[PDB]
Each structure stands twice: as C-alpha cells, then as structure tokens.
C-alpha cells in the first residue's frame, strides 16, 4: 500500500489542528493544553486506534486525524441511568426519522437494518421491526445545528454523532447530512459500512484496535460485498453478553 509524507512540509496550523482534533474525539479538556501532555495524550490515542507507532503524529497518526471517521468521542460520562453500558433490554427497535436526497427512504431504511441486523445476529439479544409507534433507535439526518451540541463542522472531520443506550430519548442514531452518503454509487461514506459503525455505538460497543475490526476508526479500504461484522467485534460483545475469551478495551 501507499505511504506518502506531506506532513513533513505541513504548516503550523495543520500540526496545531491535530492537537485539537484528538481533543474533540475524546472530550472537552482545556486543562490538558500542554506540550508534554501531547505525548501522553497522543499515546492513549494510539491504543484506541490500534496503531503500533506510539507517540507519533505525522505519518499514519496525522493522516487518520485529518481523515473522516465518526462524530462521536471515545470517552463519555453522564450519570448512570441505563443499566450497563450496552443494551440491557430484551428487544431493540429502530425507526428512520428522515431520508437524504442522496438515497431513497427505502434504501436508507433498509441499509440501517442491513447493518443493525448483523449486530444482533452476532449476539443472543433480540431485535424488533417498527410498523406502529415509536422506536428506541431513531435514524434521522441533521447537522450540529439541528438542536444538539458540537457544531456541524460540515464536510470532512466528523462523520456522524451517535447516542448511547440511555433513557427513551437517548440511544438514537444520527448522520451528518452534510457528508456524502450512498451505496450503489460507492463515492462517499457507504451507508452500509457507516451503519455498522454507527449502529454499533447505540449498542454501547466501542472502537477496536484490531486492523480488521468493524468499529475501526481508520475506516477506509477495500470494502467487499460480503463485508460483515468483525471477529474481535463479535467476540467483544459476546464477552459482555455471553462468554469471554481474552479481549481488549473499547
């Protein structure tokens, strides 16, 4: 595979932006603002991404920082209403709120199920179809100005923000309408590939350090038509829902 080196000749703005980019991908900590904290903080990011090169930021580490992925952080903390991190219910329901002109309501609705279903089929849980009433996980499009925190940011950084399984209103699925969504066009963020990563967030799941994980933050490569849930991904949830067998953090 390729591996250029443009960061070496990048401007201070590009290098400085990387520092803030990793901050938004985690939480709002303006106290960590420091030169030394960069090494320690950056190190923690390496484990989250899975990349070997630690304390690095110019080669692959910087590339992922500028490359799109998800609009959700890697660390949260807001009371403990819902039991356990992942879904603890006996059934999961989902319903699309709106569709993007990029794809038909049928293609978008079916896409979510194509990925959301794969998640359930890999767990002893259970999913239910929506045909009358409201669902737990709402699949709608909107920008950061739709009435939520964090700015839309527009195209690029930040793909979509997902909510955790908490309360009735929480645990919904959102997508950056400003981004590029499509399937048969395979030009932007494949709804199928994005759905798996986005839908997985609603299940409380977390990014994997495996190079072949479905929740991999480095999303972007040969995507086969048989693309499905990853090994470490299924084994990870099975350890919390069923039996464990040597796993890692989220």
Q: Which residues bind to Zn ion, rule: CB under 5 A?
A: 70, 148, 174
95 contacts which partner out of Ca ion, Zn ion, none, CB within 5 to 8 A by kind?
none
Q: Of 19 and 208, which has the nearer Cβ to Zn ion?
A: 208
- Strands (E) in 46-152, as ranges, are 92-96, 127-128, 137-142
Q: How far apart are CA 160 and CA 85, in angstroms?
A: 20
Task: Quickly count: other Cβ atoms within 10 Å of residue 40's Cβ.
Answer: 11
Q: Of 100 and 158, which has the nearer Cβ to Ca ion?
A: 158
Q: Of 102 and 179, which has the nearer Cβ to Ca ion?
A: 179
What is the nearest approach in angstroms of Zn ion to the Cβ of residue 147? 7
171 contacts which partner out of Zn ion, Ca ion, none, CB within 5 to 8 A by kind?
Ca ion
Q: Of 70 and 115, which has the nearer Cβ to Zn ion?
A: 70
What is the nearest approach in angstroms of Ca ion to the Cβ of residue 26? 18
144 contacts which partner out of Zn ion, Ca ion, none, CB within 5 to 8 A by kind?
none
The overall longest dimension of the chain from CA atoms, in Å, is 57
Kindly give, in sequence order, each residue whose CB lies less than 8 Å from that of residue 222, ignoring residues fewer than 6 positions away.
none
Q: How far apart are CA 112 and CA 179, in angstroms?
A: 17
Q: How far does Cα 174 stand from its chain's mean position?
A: 11
Kindly give, in sequence order, each residue whose CB lies less than 8 Å from that of residue 54, ignoring residues fewer than 6 positions away.
42, 43, 46
Q: At residue 54, what are phi and psi to the nearest 5 degrees?
A: -95, 155
86 contacts which partner out of Ca ion, Zn ion, none, CB within 5 to 8 A by kind?
none
Asked if residue 114 lies in contact with residue 195, where contact means CB atoms within 8 angstroms, the answer is: yes
Q: Of 26 and 150, which has the nearer Cβ to Ca ion?
A: 150
Q: Which residues in this chain contact Ca ion in the complex, by CB under 5 A?
A: 136, 158, 171-172, 176, 179
What is the nearest approach in angstroms of Ca ion to the Cβ of residue 14? 18
174 contacts which partner out of Zn ion, Ca ion, none, CB within 5 to 8 A by kind?
Zn ion
What is the nearest approach in angstroms of Zn ion to the Cβ of residue 34? 26
What is the nearest approach in angstroms of Zn ion to the Cβ of residue 103? 20
């Amino acid at each position: 595979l390729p591996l250029p080196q443009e960061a070496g000749g990048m401007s201070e703005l590009q290098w400085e932006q990387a520092q803030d980019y990793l901050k938004r991908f985690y939480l709002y900590d303006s106290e960590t603002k420091n030169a030394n904290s960069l090494e320690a903080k950056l190190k923690e990011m390496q484990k989250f991404f899975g990349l070997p090169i630690t304390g690095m930021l110019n080669s692959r580490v910087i590339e992922i920082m500028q490359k799109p992925r998800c609009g959700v952080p890697d660390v949260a903390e807001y009371s403990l209403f819902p039991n356990s991190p992942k879904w603890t219910s006996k059934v999961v329901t989902y319903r699309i709120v709106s569709y993007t002109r990029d794809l038909p309501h049928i293609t978008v609705d079916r896409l979510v199920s194509k990925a959301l279903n794969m998640w359930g089929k890999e767990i002893p849980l259970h999913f239910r179809k929506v045909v009358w009433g409201t669902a737990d996980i709402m699949i709608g499009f909107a920008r950061g100005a739709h009435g939520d925190s964090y700015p839309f940011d527009g195209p690029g950084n930040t793909l979509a923000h997902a909510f955790a399984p908490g309360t009735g209103l929480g645990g919904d699925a959102h997508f950056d309408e400003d981004e590029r969504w499509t399937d048969g066009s395979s030009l932007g963020i494949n709804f199928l590939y994005a759905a798996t990563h986005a839908l997985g967030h609603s299940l409380g799941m977390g990014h994997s350090s495996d190079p072949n994980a479905v929740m991999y933050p480095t999303y972007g490569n040969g995507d086969p038509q048989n693309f499905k849930l990853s090994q470490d991904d299924i084994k990870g949830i099975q350890k919390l829902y069923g039996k464990r067998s040597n796993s890692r953090k989220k």
